[PDB]
């Protein structure tokens with residue numbers, strides 16, 4: 518529950534509880550960058566209607 | 567489900583290991599349910615559970 522590991526800050530790579538996809542900030546950045554074809558999220562990709 | 571429309575299977579809120587991958591985070595199997603308190607082998611619906 519606590520995230521102190523001697524000073525090594527893993528916040529940028531640990532999952533973000535304050536987001537719906539629960540991706541890490543670095544994971545969120547990576548998913549936002551690669552979006553030429555993939556929408557970056559699967560809110561509507563499940564049915565594509 | 568995101569994979570599509572599943573017919574003949576009932577959703578289970580519990581989490582077992584995946585036997586037959588349906589897709590999009592869903593897996594199905596053949597299960598005999600005695601929890602129905604009636605007929606175990608012949609459950610009230612089709613015996614396929616996702």
Ligand SMILES: *[C@@H]1O[C@H](CO)[C@@H](O)[C@H](O)[C@H]1NC(C)=O
Pocket residue numbers: 519520521522
């Ligand atoms: C123990 O680790 C916690 C984080 O879980 C930290 O806040 C605290 O300073 C540490 N204390 C000692 C004595 O190492």
